[PDB]
Amino acid sequence: LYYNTIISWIMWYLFNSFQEPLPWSDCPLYVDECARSSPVDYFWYRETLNISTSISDSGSIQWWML
Amino acid sequence: VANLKPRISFNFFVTAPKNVSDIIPRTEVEKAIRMSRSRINDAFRLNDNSLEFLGIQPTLGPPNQPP
Ligand SMILES: *[C@@H]1O[C@H](CO)[C@@H](O[C@@H]2O[C@H](CO)[C@@H](O)[C@H](O)[C@H]2NC(C)=O)[C@H](O)[C@H]1NC(C)=O
Numbered sequence: 001l002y003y004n005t006i007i008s009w010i011m012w013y014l015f016n017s018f019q020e021p022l023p024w025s026d027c028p029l030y031v032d033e034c035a036r037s038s039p040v041d042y043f044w045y046r047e048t049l050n051i052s053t054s055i056s057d058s059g060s061i062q063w064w065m066l
Numbered sequence: 067v068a069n070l071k072p073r074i075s076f077n078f079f080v081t082a083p084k085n086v087s088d089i090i091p092r093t094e095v096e097k098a099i100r101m102s103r104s105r106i107n108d109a110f111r112l113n114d115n116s117l118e119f120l121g122i123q124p125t126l127g128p129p130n131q132p133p
Pocket residue numbers: 084085086087088089
């Protein structure tokens with residue numbers, strides 16, 4: 001059940017691998033969150049996960065993730 | 067031009083042609099450098115990062131790959 005969610009994430013990163021400047025290469029013009037840490041840490045938690053701050057915080061099915 | 071260092075640093079200001087008492091305020095000099103910076107950099111094989119006007123920040127970076 002969870003190994004097929006991890007493969008779901010892998011093939012999201014494989015589809016985004018067809019851009020000379022890979023999309024986890026630069027900051028989104030620059031998001032303070034993204035400005036802190038790095039673009040990679042931003043592409044995973046925001047651009048890919050749209051992660052919350054708690055397990056008590058569930059939201060909307062991420063269409064691209066689905 | 068003042069304060070030439072081996073770092074290749076120095077300070078400059080501008081005056082009116084035939085008037086040493088007339089000093090162009092920085093704001094106008096910043097605007098002029100912003101207008102002609104592509105040309106000034108190309109005249110020195112420099113790229114804004116190599117040629118830095120402290121107090122004048124480059125703001126022309128359009129990012130776009132997948133429409
Ligand atoms: C040269 O520039 C100086 C500085 O702008 C001029 O001095 C000013 O001139 C104006 C106009 O006469 C006066 O209102 C100011 O009170 C002057 N004081 C300053 C700002 O220094 C000067 O007149 C200019 N003269 C020439 C020969 O161009």
